[PDB]
C-alpha cells in the first residue's frame, strides 16, 4: 500500500447534545536506533 | 578520597579496565559472527 | 468472498459541509521519546532491567504530526 | 515427553529448542521478569 486517505467521520448529535471530540495525532514509521530503557516488568517506559 | 580526588578516581578507573576486558569477552559470546543463530544446536537434528 | 451483508439502499447520501476556519484550530503534541510515545518493540524480544540500542521503525522525537479531529454534524434543536 | 518439559529438568543443565532457538542452558524456576 503506497497511499493512505484518513476518512473523515461527523456524529449526528443534536445540536443541545453536541460534545468536542478528542483529536487524533497521525505520525510516519521510520526505521531508527533508539536507545531503550527496560524496566523489571519489561515495558519501555523511556527512550532516546 | 572522592570524585574531585584524581587518586581515587585511578583507583577505580583501574578496577574499571579490568571489569571492560570481562565485559568485552562475554559481548563477543553473545555475537552471532554471521551465524543463523547463537548456537547450532536445533539445526542439527530437526534439519538436515 | 466473505459476505457484508446488505449495502445500503439510501437513493441519496446526507449532505457534506466543509469549512476551513472552523477546523483551523492548532493544539501541536509533538512525540516524546522518553515518554516512549508510540514505540513498537523491533524484534518483538522482551528485555527485564537493561538498556540497549535497537534498530525498528520509530516516530521522529519532538514531532508535532498531522492532527486530524472530528466534529459533530450541523443540527437544529434536536434533529441532527 | 516428559524431558521436554522444563519442570523436570529444572535445576539441570539442558539443551533448549524452544520455539526454533537453540542453546544450551541450565533452567532454574524464579520470580517472572519481563512481558508474558
Avoid at chain 2, 15 to 39: D, H, P, R, W, Y
Avoid at chain 3, 18 to 29: A, G, L, S, V
Avoid at chain 4, 5 to 34: D, H, M
Wanted: hydrophobic share 35%; aromatic share 12%.
Amino acid at each position: 500500500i503506497k497511499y493512505y486517505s484518513i476518512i473523515p467521520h461527523s456524529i449526528r448529535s443534536i445540536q443541545s447534545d453536541r460534545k468536542a471530540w478528542a483529536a487524533f495525532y497521525v505520525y510516519k514509521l521510520q526505521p531508527l536506533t533508539f536507545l531503550l530503557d527496560f524496566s523489571v516488568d519489561g515495558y519501555i517506559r523511556r527512550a532516546i | 578520597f572522592t570524585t574531585t580526588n584524581e587518586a581515587f578516581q585511578k583507583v577505580q578507573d583501574a578496577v574499571n579496565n579490568n571489569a571492560q576486558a570481562l565485559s568485552k569477552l562475554a559481548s563477543e559470546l553473545s555475537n552471532t559472527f554471521g551465524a543463523i543463530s547463537a548456537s547450532i544446536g536445533d539445526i542439527i537434528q530437526r534439519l538436515d | 468472498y466473505v459476505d457484508v451483508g446488505p449495502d445500503s439502499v439510501k437513493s441519496a447520501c446526507i449532505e457534506v459541509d466543509i469549512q476551513q476556519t472552523f477546523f483551523d484550530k492548532t493544539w501541536p503534541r509533538p512525540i516524546d521519546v522518553s515518554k516512549a510515545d508510540g514505540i513498537i518493540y523491533p524484534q518483538g524480544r522482551t528485555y527485564s532491567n537493561i538498556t540497549i540500542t535497537y534498530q525498528g521503525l520509530f516516530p521522529y522525537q519532538g514531532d508535532h504530526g498531522d492532527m486530524y479531529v472530528y466534529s459533530a454534524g450541523h443540527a437544529t434543536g434536536t434533529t441532527p | 515427553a516428559n524431558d521436554t518439559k522444563i519442570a523436570s529438568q529444572l535445576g539441570n543443565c539442558v539443551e533448549y529448542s524452544l520455539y526454533g532457538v537453540s542453546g544450551r542452558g541450565v533452567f532454574q524456576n524464579c520470580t517472572a521478569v519481563g512481558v508474558r
